[PDB]
Ligand binder design. Structure first.
Ligand code: ZN
Ligand code: ZN
Length: 66
């Protein structure tokens, strides 16, 4: 219906900065739960192409495919 996301509170996965897991973002390269602004408060823009946590955003160098 419209209440399948009622328990959006990930088990053992919440924004450590807030304590809440309400509308918490997930990492695509690993498993994580955080709010973008809570991890990247430097004015970093949230990418729609691959949500990346702090660790996964450390080294991001793609392989030049020709
Ligand atoms: Zn937060
Ligand atoms: Zn990650």
């Amino acid at each position: 219906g419209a209440m399948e996301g009622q328990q959006n509170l990930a088990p053992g996965a919440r924004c450590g900065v807030c304590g809440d897991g309400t509308d918490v973002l997930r990492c695509t390269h690993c498993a994580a739960a955080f709010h973008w602004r809570c991890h990247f408060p430097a004015g970093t823009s949230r990418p729609g192409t691959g949500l990346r946590c702090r660790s996964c955003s450390g080294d991001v160098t793609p392989a030049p495919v020709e």
